[PDB]
Design a protein around this ligand. Structure first.
Ligand SMILES: [Zn+2]
Ligand SMILES: [Zn+2]
Lengths: 152, 150
């Protein structure tokens, strides 16, 4: 485990909770440079905040980093409170982000988690209970909104 | 399919429009398969908005707005260039069954095959207009191109 994992998941959960407060889906994340622990960006799901079909927590996080050179992505970790969907898996693959740390994969899991390993990326599931609890609360109280985010 | 000509004409329109704005000439649109209605269209906004994620497919899907998951299940996504792993994942996640690609000569990624692997139909039309405009951008601005896909 990398020394910044605790920092990364803390920030990612902060983003998920902030997003929950604003009325949206409690999925957050951030991008951390593995060398020195700098936070390149952070964000949360913007489906309800901005009416966005594409701004998942992982995409929002990457957009909030701005355009980075390819070399930067190559030594980063992306932290996300929920297991990534097929789109966010593709983003991680496309940018070449070597490490993906997942809060939990209990309330949601896609084929992207294993496809990340197939494409050579390290996936870490921490099984964070704070993430599980906030995500389970949203699902339980707004289930119809929940199925829209995963395109069911 | 009867809308393929219309869909590629719109996607090319978007790509040429984005080229005139100074951006990457990659455009697309989403078409409902039953009646041929355009659900949304867009182009790559990398240079227009300093965007890391707003590829032509992602831009196109953003411009449709939030839709019910079932709407996507009988649509076709048109794109002027073969999609990257990210746009491929968007097509997979949303359940868009059909993808019509203008050309995969100037660019082709693992996402074309992965799309078929995951049960989606991928059709490459080898449009010459798309190849021409994309080749031009690559030849005029190879450093921007390689900074993006290299
Ligand atoms: Zn996602
Ligand atoms: Zn793409």
């Amino acid at each position: 485990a990398s020394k910044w994992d605790q920092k990364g998941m803390d920030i990612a959960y902060e983003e998920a909770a902030l997003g929950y407060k604003e009325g949206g889906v409690p999925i957050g994340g951030c991008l951390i440079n593995n060398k020195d622990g700098s936070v390149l960006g952070r964000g949360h799901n913007m489906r309800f905040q901005k009416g966005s079909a594409t701004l998942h927590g992982e995409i929002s996080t990457l957009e909030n980093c701005g355009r980075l050179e390819g070399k930067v992505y190559k030594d980063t970790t992306l932290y996300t409170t929920l297991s990534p969907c097929d789109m966010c898996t593709g983003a991680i693959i496309w940018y070449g982000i070597p490490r993906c740390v997942v809060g939990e994969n209990v309330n949601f899991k896609s084929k992207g988690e294993k496809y990340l390993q197939t494409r050579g990326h390290e996936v870490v599931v921490v099984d964070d209970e704070r993430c599980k609890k906030i995500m389970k609360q949203f699902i339980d109280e707004r289930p119809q909104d929940w199925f829209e985010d995963i395109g069911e």
